[PDB]
Amino acid sequence: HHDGFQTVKATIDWEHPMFKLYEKAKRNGKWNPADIDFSQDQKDFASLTSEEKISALPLVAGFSAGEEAATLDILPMAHALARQGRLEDVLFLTTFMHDEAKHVEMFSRWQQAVGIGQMDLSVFHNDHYKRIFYEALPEAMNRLYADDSPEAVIRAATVYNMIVEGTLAESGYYTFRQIYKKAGLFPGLLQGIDYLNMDEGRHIQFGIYTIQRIVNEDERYYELFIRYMDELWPHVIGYVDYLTELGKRQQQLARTYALEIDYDLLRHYVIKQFNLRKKQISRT
Amino acid sequence: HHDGFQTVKATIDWEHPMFKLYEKAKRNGKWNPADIDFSQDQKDFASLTSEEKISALPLVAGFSAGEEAATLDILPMAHALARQGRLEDVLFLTTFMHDEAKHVEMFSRWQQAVGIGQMDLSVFHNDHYKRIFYEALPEAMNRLYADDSPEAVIRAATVYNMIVEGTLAESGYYTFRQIYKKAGLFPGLLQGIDYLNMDEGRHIQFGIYTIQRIVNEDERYYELFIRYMDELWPHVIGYVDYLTELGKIDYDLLRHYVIKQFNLRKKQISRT
Ligand SMILES: CCCCCCCCCCCCCCCC(=O)O
Ligand SMILES: CCCCCCCCCCCCCCCC(=O)O
Ligand SMILES: [Fe+3]
Ligand SMILES: [Fe+3]
Ligand SMILES: [Mn+2]
Ligand SMILES: [Mn+2]
Ligand SMILES: [Mn+3]
Ligand SMILES: [Mn+3]
Numbered sequence: 001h002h003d004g005f006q007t008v009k010a011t012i013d014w015e016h017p018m019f020k021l022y023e024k025a026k027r028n029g030k031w032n033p034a035d036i037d038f039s040q041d042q043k044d045f046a047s048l049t050s051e052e053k054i055s056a057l058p059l060v061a062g063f064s065a066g067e068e069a070a071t072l073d074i075l076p077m078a079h080a081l082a083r084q085g086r087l088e089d090v091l092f093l094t095t096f097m098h099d100e101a102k103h104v105e106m107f108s109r110w111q112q113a114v115g116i117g118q119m120d121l122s123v124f125h126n127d128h129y130k131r132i133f134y135e136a137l138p139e140a141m142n143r144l145y146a147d148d149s150p151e152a153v154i155r156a157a158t159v160y161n162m163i164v165e166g167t168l169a170e171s172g173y174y175t176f177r178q179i180y181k182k183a184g185l186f187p188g189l190l191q192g193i194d195y196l197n198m199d200e201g202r203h204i205q206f207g208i209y210t211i212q213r214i215v216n217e218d219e220r221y222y223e224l225f226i227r228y229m230d231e232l233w234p235h236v237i238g239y240v241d242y243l244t245e246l247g248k249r250q251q252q253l254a255r256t257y258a259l260e261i262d263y264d265l266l267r268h269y270v271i272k273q274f275n276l277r278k279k280q281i282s283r284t
Numbered sequence: 285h286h287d288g289f290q291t292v293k294a295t296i297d298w299e300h301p302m303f304k305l306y307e308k309a310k311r312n313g314k315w316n317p318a319d320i321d322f323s324q325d326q327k328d329f330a331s332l333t334s335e336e337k338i339s340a341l342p343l344v345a346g347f348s349a350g351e352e353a354a355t356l357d358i359l360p361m362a363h364a365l366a367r368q369g370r371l372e373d374v375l376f377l378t379t380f381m382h383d384e385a386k387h388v389e390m391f392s393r394w395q396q397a398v399g400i401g402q403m404d405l406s407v408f409h410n411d412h413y414k415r416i417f418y419e420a421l422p423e424a425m426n427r428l429y430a431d432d433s434p435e436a437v438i439r440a441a442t443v444y445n446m447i448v449e450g451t452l453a454e455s456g457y458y459t460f461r462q463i464y465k466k467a468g469l470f471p472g473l474l475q476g477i478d479y480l481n482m483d484e485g486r487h488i489q490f491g492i493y494t495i496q497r498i499v500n501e502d503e504r505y506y507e508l509f510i511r512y513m514d515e516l517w518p519h520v521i522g523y524v525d526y527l528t529e530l531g532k533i534d535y536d537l538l539r540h541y542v543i544k545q546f547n548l549r550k551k552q553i554s555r556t
Contacts, residue, residue, distance in 0.1 A: 001418055001419050001422055001423070002349075002353060002356075002417065002418045002419075002422055003418075004349075004406055004418075005348065005349040005352040005353065005406075006352065007348040007349070007351075007352050007388055007391065007392040007395070008345055008348050008349045008352070008404070008405045008406050008409075009404045009405075009406060010401065010402070010404075011392045011395055011396050011401035012388070012389065012392045012393075014396070022385075023318060026316050026318070026386075027316075030314065032310050032311070034307060034310070061292055064289065064291045064292050065286075065288075065289040065291070065292045067291070068289045068290065068291050068292070068371070069286060069289065071366075071374060071375070071378070072286075072366045072374065075359060075362055075363050075366065076363075078359055079359050079360075079363070082356045082359060087352070087388075090355060090356065090385070091355070091385045091388070091389065094355070094378070094381045094382040094384075094385040095382060095385075097378045097381065097382075098378040098379060098381075098382045100378075101306075101374070101375045101378040101379075102310075104291055104296070104371075104375070105296065105375065107291065108291040108295045108296045109296075111291070111295055112295050112296075112298070117294060117295035118294070120292070120293050120294075121292045121293070122288055122289075122292050122293060125292075133286070134285055134286045134287075134288075135285055138285055138286055139285070145429065
């Protein structure tokens, strides 16, 4: 039952950080995947040999499942904060969920447009990927339906916002630009990636806000945050090494397009993101 | 756990009715309550007598709580359809939920602007209103966390989309126009109502789609729909009568609009 309603008894807290993030989301979130022109992407993909065609699909396979999981698995966080009466967080999360829906749509439209929608891309999810996206992420979020303790909320935001979004997604955006933007391939996908990257800035800020406000009540949760980050790192880098090894064994695209794909630079960027996400949470 | 992902094994079902409704929601759902100019509404409100001021508040109190319940209480429907693999339904429901968030925002901005944000409008929720919005609606939606049977889904969509939205919300939009537009009062609020009414057409279309697809599998669910509608009617009309009595423009015309909405929502679901 509802005991009452904040906007009947009072008003929205207009100065709440998540209300302000909600306002930015509305201003900055107007893009529509359906407006992206993928016609040149189709031409580029058809121009590639079978070998070069593969080069791109592991990254896309990882994003497409990632966005779909993101759309499904944010709902328990919205429920948990709703039940706690955090109306402004809920408002913001409506924009978060609608963002992820557009991300799912964007990658699916690209697969359809380039002619691979019929191809099962699950073959590029190795065991580490599945540990994060098929298992740990839904387990951490779904926990919130029966356990919305500070410990549970911190773990959910860590896995979702700090690891999946703040480490993997961010490193995937960078990787996409380092490879396909340099090669001049897939302009529509790159337009998508840039929209996604803009959206993701708000999603990571929500996670930072959430974790920090819990750490602010008891700095003992800071150690829990660090620990959960470190627990998932082996699967983060396990997946990144899988992708790297795939890239190193599929050299055709980089040769054709005169790219010196510095995979050691990519790996360094992932480590960099992981440690900088840790640093955006303060003990005090 | 996730067993797999539809957009990795295949793609979105581009022809799915809720994907089409999602596409329409993006194209038609751009409005922003922060852009509505409420400055004249403030002046209009200040120009009313004390008694006229209090005459406007019950309808607003009904809506502000209704939108807030709507925002919170659609989440279990999104979860249950997600768990069923109904990906295109979920995509659409992200636009549904963000719509209700903007509706909450719009009424609260109006209350702030005209100077009543500090006033507790719960005084204007009577027992019938509470039965629907404080109790039956959250009860029926939250049930979906543990029971997503066809019967539970039909009941949730009946209470939410056909009664709260399809009967009360639609009747409130009409009421605001019949009263305040003819009076030339609260133009910002009426711009908001127009945007809300446009959004609401999609929300009601989702409820129709959901209820009919369950009815299509077994015609005995049609009788459940009708029964759930009738069960809620006494509270619908008990709240409407309470509002009508406070006002004492043609209240009988308004009251008949509610009955008309109720019946036509019933008619939009087919036995066969
Ligand atoms: C070769 C370097 C590897 C870099 C790592 C690439 C990671 C690709 C996986 C993308 C999944 C991101 C899902 C985002 C979820 C969200 O949007 O909230
Ligand atoms: C004087 C005649 C009364 C007519 C009916 C007035 C009803 C007021 C509306 C309250 C509920 C609105 C909540 C709808 C939720 C949504 O937007 O989905
Ligand atoms: Fe995200
Ligand atoms: Fe609605
Ligand atoms: Mn391994
Ligand atoms: Mn009564
Ligand atoms: Mn995303
Ligand atoms: Mn509404």
